[PDB]
Amino acid sequence: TTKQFSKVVEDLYRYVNAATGKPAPMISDDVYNIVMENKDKLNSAIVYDRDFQYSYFGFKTLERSYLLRINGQVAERPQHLIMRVALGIHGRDIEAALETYNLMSLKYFTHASPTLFNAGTPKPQMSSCFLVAMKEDSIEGIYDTLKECALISKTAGGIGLHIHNIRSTGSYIAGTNGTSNGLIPMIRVFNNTARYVDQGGPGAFALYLEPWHADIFDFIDIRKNHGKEEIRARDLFPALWIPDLFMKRVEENGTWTLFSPTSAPGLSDCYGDEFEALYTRYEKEGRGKTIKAQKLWYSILEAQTETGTPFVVYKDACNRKSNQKNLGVIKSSNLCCEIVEYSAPDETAVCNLASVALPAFIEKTSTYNFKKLHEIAKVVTRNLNRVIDRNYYPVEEARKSNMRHRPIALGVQGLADTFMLLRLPFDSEEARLLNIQIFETIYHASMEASCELAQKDGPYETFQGSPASQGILQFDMWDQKPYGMWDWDTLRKDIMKHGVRNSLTMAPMPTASTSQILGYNECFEPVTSNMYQVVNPYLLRDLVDLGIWDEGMKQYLITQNGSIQGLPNVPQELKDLYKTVWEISQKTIINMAADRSVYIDQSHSLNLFLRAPTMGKLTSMHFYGWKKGLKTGMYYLRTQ
Amino acid sequence: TTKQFSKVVEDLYRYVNAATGKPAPMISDDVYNIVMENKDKLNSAIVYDRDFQYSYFGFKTLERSYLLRINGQVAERPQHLIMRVALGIHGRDIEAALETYNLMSLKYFTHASPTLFNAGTPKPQMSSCFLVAMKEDSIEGIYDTLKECALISKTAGGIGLHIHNIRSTGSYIAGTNGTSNGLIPMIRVFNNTARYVDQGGPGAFALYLEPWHADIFDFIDIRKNHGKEEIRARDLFPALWIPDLFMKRVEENGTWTLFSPTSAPGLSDCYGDEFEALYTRYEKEGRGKTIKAQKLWYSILEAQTETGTPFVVYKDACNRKSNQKNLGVIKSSNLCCEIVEYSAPDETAVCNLASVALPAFIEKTSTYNFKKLHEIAKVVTRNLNRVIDRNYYPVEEARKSNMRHRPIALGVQGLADTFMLLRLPFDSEEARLLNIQIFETIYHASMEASCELAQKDGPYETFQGSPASQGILQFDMWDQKPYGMWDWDTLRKDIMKHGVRNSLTMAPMPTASTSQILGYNECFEPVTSNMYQVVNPYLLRDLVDLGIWDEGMKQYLITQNGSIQGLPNVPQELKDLYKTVWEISQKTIINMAADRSVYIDQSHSLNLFLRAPTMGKLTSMHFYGWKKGLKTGMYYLRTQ
Ligand SMILES: Nc1nc2c(ncn2[C@H]2C[C@H](O)[C@@H](COP(=O)(O)OP(=O)(O)OP(=O)(O)O)O2)c(=O)[nH]1
Ligand SMILES: Nc1nc2c(ncn2[C@H]2C[C@H](O)[C@@H](COP(=O)(O)OP(=O)(O)OP(=O)(O)O)O2)c(=O)[nH]1
Ligand SMILES: Nc1ncnc2c1ncn2[C@@H]1O[C@H](COP(=O)(O)OP(=O)(O)O)[C@@H](O)[C@H]1CCO
Ligand SMILES: Nc1ncnc2c1ncn2[C@@H]1O[C@H](COP(=O)(O)OP(=O)(O)O)[C@@H](O)[C@H]1CCO
Numbered sequence A, B: 001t002t003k004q005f006s007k008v009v010e011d012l013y014r015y016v017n018a019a020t021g022k023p024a025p026m027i028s029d030d031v032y033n034i035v036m037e038n039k040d041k042l043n044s045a046i047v048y049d050r051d052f053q054y055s056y057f058g059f060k061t062l063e064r065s066y067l068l069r070i071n072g073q074v075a076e077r078p079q080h081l082i083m084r085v086a087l088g089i090h091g092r093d094i095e096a097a098l099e100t101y102n103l104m105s106l107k108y109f110t111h112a113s114p115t116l117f118n119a120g121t122p123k124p125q126m127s128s129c130f131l132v133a134m135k136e137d138s139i140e141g142i143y144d145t146l147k148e149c150a151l152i153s154k155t156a157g158g159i160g161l162h163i164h165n166i167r168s169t170g171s172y173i174a175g176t177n178g179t180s181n182g183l184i185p186m187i188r189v190f191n192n193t194a195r196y197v198d199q200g201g202p203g204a205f206a207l208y209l210e211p212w213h214a215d216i217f218d219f220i221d222i223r224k225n226h227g228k229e230e231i232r233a234r235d236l237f238p239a240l241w242i243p244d245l246f247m248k249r250v251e252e253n254g255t256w257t258l259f260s261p262t263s264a265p266g267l268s269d270c271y272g273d274e275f276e277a278l279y280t281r282y283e284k285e286g287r288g289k290t291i292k293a294q295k296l297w298y299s300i301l302e303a304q305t306e307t308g309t310p311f312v313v314y315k316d317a318c319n320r321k322s323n324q325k326n327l328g329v330i331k332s333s334n335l336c337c338e339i340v341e342y343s344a345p346d347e348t349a350v351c352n353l354a355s356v357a358l359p360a361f362i363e364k365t366s367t368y369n370f371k372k373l374h375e376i377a378k379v380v381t382r383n384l385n386r387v388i389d390r391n392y393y394p395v396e397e398a399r400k401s402n403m404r405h406r407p408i409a410l411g412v413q414g415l416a417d418t419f420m421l422l423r424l425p426f427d428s429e430e431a432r433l434l435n436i437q438i439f440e441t442i443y444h445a446s447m448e449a450s451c452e453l454a455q456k457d458g459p460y461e462t463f464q465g466s467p468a469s470q471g472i473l474q475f476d477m478w479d480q481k482p483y484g485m486w487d488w489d490t491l492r493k494d495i496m497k498h499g500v501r502n503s504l505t506m507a508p509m510p511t512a513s514t515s516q517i518l519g520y521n522e523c524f525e526p527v528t529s530n531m532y533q534v535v536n537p538y539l540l541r542d543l544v545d546l547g548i549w550d551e552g553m554k555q556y557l558i559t560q561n562g563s564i565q566g567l568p569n570v571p572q573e574l575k576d577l578y579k580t581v582w583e584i585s586q587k588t589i590i591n592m593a594a595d596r597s598v599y600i601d602q603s604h605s606l607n608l609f610l611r612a613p614t615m616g617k618l619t620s621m622h623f624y625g626w627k628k629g630l631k632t633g634m635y636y637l638r639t640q
């Protein structure tokens, strides 16, 4: 690799596809002109010694799919990547650019994959999430929506697609005097388009459906591994958009009615008591097919046990506690179950994501620098706002959405690292408290920075009439007082006076690849193993420190699922600290998820981990988080 | 069934879908009002004794899929169908309506299936053929075209789709700096849409491709029955759009070059010598991949031997001898290889079809009433023009095409019946002459009627600059004098002075189901068996007449493939007369096809029948019809 950043940018800008002779610049006109106008300042700002902030699997992560290539050879050093992204985000604001380069290079936070991939390049598609409305219950709306999904999927970013408006199997078609074959054949069309289109030369969509839809029994079964094949769509992910009524009927052991949307209009366009009144009326009018609620329930659990899906997101929780409720009824989340944003046939919700590296704020005894965290969170908030304006939107429905409501999604990684570093068991009171105070500071920081942005550039277009315009912040919608490490009254006073620039700011995402770069555990989940063929950095230090680290102890970690429990000669304090996620009660997981959720605007991608899975255990877990008021009750079910 | 036509129309108009309570009228507002305004005249015109013009399999054909149903019970008698169609075609012109009812009821001609199905109903989609241009080499054009195919396929009618502009496997994509996976993955998308959409609640498309396209080797193999599966599209039909150059290179045992359309632009938008100059230049410029022509050729024949496809239509023949050549370059035919009409991204060629029942004009000794044939052909021509104006077009590209150029497609059925009735072997000089004089009269009749229509309503919009505006009729483009049973000079004089109303008028189609209704053999092919478990009506009469019809003779027809050759006690005159298509030289088939083609404006769906098929025999057959100047060199290859 060439060392000088400005020479790397030149090579990239001047790139020509040799096989075709076509100029194929890999830097935008804009960022090139900026680098060239400031090349001494930029070249000498990079500290190339920081490529040793990464590790074997973290560097080989970047080198393998993030660092831009010329002719199949890596052309970017990691610091070049980071400065390219800083510039791609900040443009002419060199000071901002320099601050972002410095904080990212020292691993305080990072932006999501699409940003890392595309910032600073000619069609910079930096947004990770698209939430698409099925446009209409017609061939035309179906094929228009399919086309919009193909165009989005050509430029990277997952899709959450809601399809509650498509009439079900056996329904009448007036134009041809025929009968619909329902959702499964249509899903199969979408499945083929996700396969055909492979991010520019493969798609992953999540499909959302309310569980009164009459094809629901087949919908939930789409990833099943066994027999029928023309009834399965194994490259898509089903997600349930569950009303509280469903959960009530199941716990009551009552009935549930399945409708075609054409027989029972408007269900997905209301929520809560209004839904409950409309749904019960349609029930009483003989407009659908009644079954035992617990019959559906059983089939759901059986599909989650075999496939890990469907996902579970609670419709009424998502709508009652959204700052976007003045926009209309929200009808989906997204591929990874963290975005809850409004979508409609002309508005495709988009989000831009970044994660704070929670261990960077640890400082004999260790403490956590919340003031540095608040400061970094505001930096990241401002970055993500800037991404909104600098983004290439693959379809017009997505520009119109984002330009109007300007949502953002801050998250985190290395929560488990943080606890371990601080010697707190995951299930400890200390870890409970740290969880709350971390999320409280991130949300405060985000809102303070967004309010600063509203005083500068004006509130987002639809701020007026929002819960936040009336001083109702997220934790107020959960009917709770905040923990109070930060002054929320002054914040709220300023927000009601001056607005905020972003409708939403927090959606802790999976970080499935960005944590790997930084060398931390993903998002907010415990560790899954203390051995991945390398052992937990923290565990290792301790074992060595106690003189019990030997071969005959290395083995009971390879052989034993990366768990240290039961291991004869290990102190109990290590055992508590290094519990694996299969060893931590999911009630504790659900509890901590509820604690943090009061400070999460959107939702969070809560995977669930069941070791010895029974239909009864799984039911308790769903009902426990449902009654906790969780929005995303479940992302994947990981088993066995 | 109710007997009175006006009461049947009432029941149909007033129909309500009981399961949904939705009024679902099965007659148009327009035709209902006409019937009700003329109900005595219409009711008393029907001769209900004519439902015994049909046979076991012909009635049970109509009853099973043509005659309109209420609640799953047939509501229409055949005469009701015919009067409904007559009205649907003619509207307020009751006299015309009455004449068409009379001639169809006595089985002189019929209209194609979509007309029979849909005439007189609220969205009367009466056209059988759509020829669609791939709109653009982009995701957007691909998905727009897919949507147009789904919308067309919702209302019945086959699609011929041309895809020569889609860049091939391995080609560069600049927007995503990636690589195309080529045609086969895209075909697979179209295959899934044909399956999803099943004529209103399954599609059949033919795909057209010129054989220089770089994915051609996989394209031709798509219906193959054996291994790979993600490289096959078994609900679509590949058709080759072959330039003369290809055939020359193969016979020369030279080379052939494969290009991506992005490396060699404009190939499909020229023909003949201009194509040959552009193609050779691109060859010399190293823009593609050179192979042995005969290597492609071999693979084509191997696919035709296994699958019956690809079809073969000759691009340069189709363009050099089209009255539509002032429109631009024609880039496909259609599902059944008879329509050759211009299409483009904003113009989808449509055609409306009907067949003359050739035996109706037979009158000790038998003669053929050509004057009655000419008269009926003009009746049918005028019907098909009227269909153009009364049609519901499923997409705007198809209305714009048809309204502009007004093509039509007359054809025939029961050619083989006719010969047999007249005691002429298929391969006889008498049958050769009858073939020519039949097609000469149909074409003359069509053009005379279309000229009458142009004096009344004006020529079609693009008539000016057409070969016909300059007095070049179809047989002139083949450099031949007509047989001269009719006065062509007076016709041409009038056409050059007053125009014609239709750009094209003749495309003998398969009649795969309409012949069955009428009880005749399909279109213009010999019989395939003298036994289908019932024997040839004509053969039967003869065997009985000779006192050789017994059980021990019935068997050597069941056991012997419906062939009478070799059969000890049958006269030679029967043997010659009742040759099966596996027993008639394909050179004779090709010869008669060439004779008739000088009077066929578009093309004709020429199936080929090879008993003992070798690569050498098949080559001769292709080269024989190619050098005869055939447009459709081959539709299906039927084997074994
Ligand atoms: N399988 C697959 N094919 C694609 C993908 N994206 C584009 N293609 C194909 C479709 C077309 O035949 C060709 C060009 O597509 P587009 O026009 O949409 O690509 P773009 O305009 O961004 O690049 P271009 O300037 O035309 O080379 O490449 C993809 O993501 N997956
Ligand atoms: N499988 C299949 N589904 C179809 C077909 N045609 C329509 N559908 C489905 C798609 C939609 O979910 C629903 C309605 O489609 P359209 O709006 O295109 O039907 P149309 O407007 O002619 O009848 P409508 O008035 O809406 O009942 O039926 C078809 O031909 N095959
Ligand atoms: N296979 C895939 N294709 C496209 N988008 C994907 C994807 N897997 C995840 N995403 C999208 O990436 C977002 C965050 O997932 P995350 O796992 O945090 O991504 P990175 O660590 O790679 O930045 C999610 O919010 C999801 C979009 C939601 O509609
Ligand atoms: N399976 C199918 N689906 C849709 N259209 C079809 C079809 N099979 C044939 N056709 C369409 O029907 C036309 C004439 O075929 P023919 O076999 O003469 O039809 P009928 O005897 O049923 O009237 C052809 O010109 C083809 C359209 C060309 O694009």
Ligand SMILES: [Mg+2]
Pocket (backbone or CB within 6 Å): A137, A138
């Ligand atoms: Mg509709």
Ligand SMILES: [Mg+2]
Pocket (backbone or CB within 6 Å): B137, B138
């Ligand atoms: Mg393009």
